[PDB]
Design a protein around this ligand. Structure first.
Ligand SMILES: O=C(O)CCC(=O)C(=O)O
Ligand SMILES: O=C(O)CCC(=O)C(=O)O
Ligand SMILES: O=C(O)CCC(=O)C(=O)O
Ligand SMILES: [Fe+2]
Ligand SMILES: [Fe+2]
Ligand SMILES: [Fe+2]
Lengths: 282, 282, 282
């Protein structure tokens, strides 16, 4: 195999170009960069600038007013690092300016996520139980995370349908995010023109095993690079509804070690009553 | 904010004094010391002395006779540390003397726990589904843990309604337990006259978000203090029944990242079929 | 107590010999070596040789063709170590030669596992809900794991009915696997003539507390032994069906900290929708 992490334009995919290349990427890799999806570096910088302004300049009192009473990182602020989370509703916003910027940014991401998911399902000939549009009108979670200088994040796969990741780079050039491609870890650097997409385990489940869910982690710099090593990431998880229904025997055929009686099950039956975003192979 | 960990007398709370102070503590802090609740240092020493006598002087055979066949730390003895656990029934007791002392101590703790929980629910105007008394007649767990000298315990929040903690101090004066208060970790030292109460996630859930569940951890001494660094803690978790029922949309409003179809759910639906006492934000 | 890890011949057990010795082993230890069960070193070497030939000599492409799209270690190959997994169906085999050898080896293990489980249930007078044979016609998982040189595996107990383990030895003589026996960790070395059996938590549950589920872990060599320290293990888990049904109050009597409403429950109710193989006491 070529272990190159490919790039696809969403616009060309939506026109039916590169079908074989895409299908083969999904099955053998499960990850790719995505251009022409409505997501520019400019916007990433509008949103990143206002949130980082809050991480740095927001009072204790202002942070408290947008902190959930249980510290789940589902909505609002969570303070060696800081996080800002959002979904389609129940959001906590520091101000009217933040809210316009972050609502627009969320929506752009949720649109791109749905749009690439529709292409994954089309490329694999997949009609989810309940149909495509009800499957994609779901329960996404957006987490933006600022990381200070000196693994960083242990290897896992995602339990999303897809995950979209926009990063800003280490000022000193270190590349933190890596994924397993062809049996070894490959760099996944920042690209101002593109978003990284990871397929998660739900893509594998829904498509009956036609899409890989790759393992990935976040590396630590060599101490020779422990100045200029901070970074941010925007991680958008497209997560199915609780009532997403799948075939139990088909789940079994593609590696899922389910303990489910009977022939069909829901996402809730499988994962339980709280979203679980990531999983270790261990 | 004043980041002082407040103290309340249960007796004054039960007389309706300090209502605003208490409500504001619950919402902004989720933790406090509690005096006048039936829990003296003297008793803590009666119970601690007999169990430590067992940790030290009980035979292998005697420990085996009060060890569960699965090592869950639910009931009896568990052997870098030792634990003694109890609930309302199915207990394992080393002897008739231990049993009287530990039954009385359990009951005192379970009484105080219920009594402070009733005040939390009253201060927030909360009527659990099924009413207050059936909610508080629940499934508590008491764990007493002896820790040897050289984190100790990673940061988490509790999934209890409330947790009551009685500690004995490090002979060398180090303060191991800390909690997040006002965005930073604050010491929670021993107080012979008071118990520490942590609100857990069930308090947040039941009250619709009026109570914080704070993160806390147990620190390690600086090696300059790795003689005289042993300690014990008595941790009493007030845990709801499996059939505790709550509103799904309300859960969502207060930060809980539930994957629950439909409008109501039970504690079992949310957490699954085994009690889970604590959780990481990660 | 004698903290010796005992050995039983399955053939003598099946003839009703050593009943008291076996019962007392199950209750106080939960672990033993097993001879005369159809499992020779010769076979272990037929299977180990072909899989190690694949770990070393199989192409990237060949490994990919027997890698599941989600990296669960349920079936096929998983690449600091490599694993090969199998069950009763949905297997991924590198070739017709591997398949004959591994099918036969699986089946031998599944036979021995069932046969010792039947003896455990008989020795304790246990009739599972739904009867013995439907209980033992279950959902086993076989994992073969090659470990390179420099804990290795953290302490846990198994959630199996029984687990059978065949190891090959460290060329330098170090003994990696240990279990808690009589309150301390005891070596469990390779024995060409025997398999190690661990009782798991399901044995404890089904038998109403007559069998211990011991904790065990895998130790690291002293750096004085970090050449010749690689090893392999074949771990066979006998895991109940999702619909295995047990008594909730009885579960509670033997240490299980269940959050289950009502009087009976299924394995799925307790553990959820994915198999969980092992558990920490923590
Ligand atoms: O921070 C990153 O780039 C990756 C984060 C990630 O994989 C996750 O949150 O799942
Ligand atoms: O040992 C302590 O003081 C705290 C223990 C704790 O937070 C717990 O068991 O949840
Ligand atoms: O590798 C070994 O010998 C033990 C493995 C083990 O206990 C397990 O996979 O549960
Ligand atoms: Fe991830
Ligand atoms: Fe705690
Ligand atoms: Fe194990």
């Amino acid at each position: 195999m070529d272990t190159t992490v490919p790039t696809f334009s969403l616009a060309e995919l939506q026109q039916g170009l590169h079908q074989d290349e895409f299908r083969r990427c999904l099955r053998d890799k499960g990850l790719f960069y995505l251009t022409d999806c409505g997501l520019t570096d400019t916007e990433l910088k509008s949103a990143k600038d206002l949130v980082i302004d809050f991480f740095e300049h927001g009072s204790e009192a202002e942070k408290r007013a947008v902190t959930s009473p249980v510290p789940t990182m589902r909505r609002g602020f969570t303070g060696y690092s800081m996080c800002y989370s959002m979904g389609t509703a129940d959001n906590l916003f520091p101000s009217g300016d933040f809210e316009r910027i972050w609502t627009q940014y969320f929506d752009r991401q949720y649109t791109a996520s749905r749009a690439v998911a529709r292409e994954v399902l089309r490329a694999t000939g997949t009609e989810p139980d309940g149909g495509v549009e009800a499957f994609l009108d779901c329960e996404p979670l957006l987490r933006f995370r600022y990381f200070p200088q000196v693994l960083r994040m242990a290897p896992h796969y995602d339990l999303s349908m897809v995950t979209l990741i926009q990063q800003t780079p280490c000022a000193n050039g270190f590349v933190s995010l890596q994924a397993e491609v062809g049996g070894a870890f490959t760099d996944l650097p920042y690209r101002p023109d593109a978003v990284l997409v990871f397929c998660g385990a739900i893509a594998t489940l829904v498509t009956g095993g036609q899409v890989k869910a790759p393992r990935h982690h976040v590396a630590a710099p060599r101490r020779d690079q422990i100045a200029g090593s901070s970074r941010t990431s925007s991680v958008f998880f497209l997560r199915p509804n609780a009532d997403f229904t799948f075939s139990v025997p088909l789940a079994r055929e593609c590696g899922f070690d389910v303990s489910l009686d009977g022939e069909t099950a829901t996402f809730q039956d499988w994962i339980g009553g709280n979203y679980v975003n990531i999983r270790r192979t261990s």
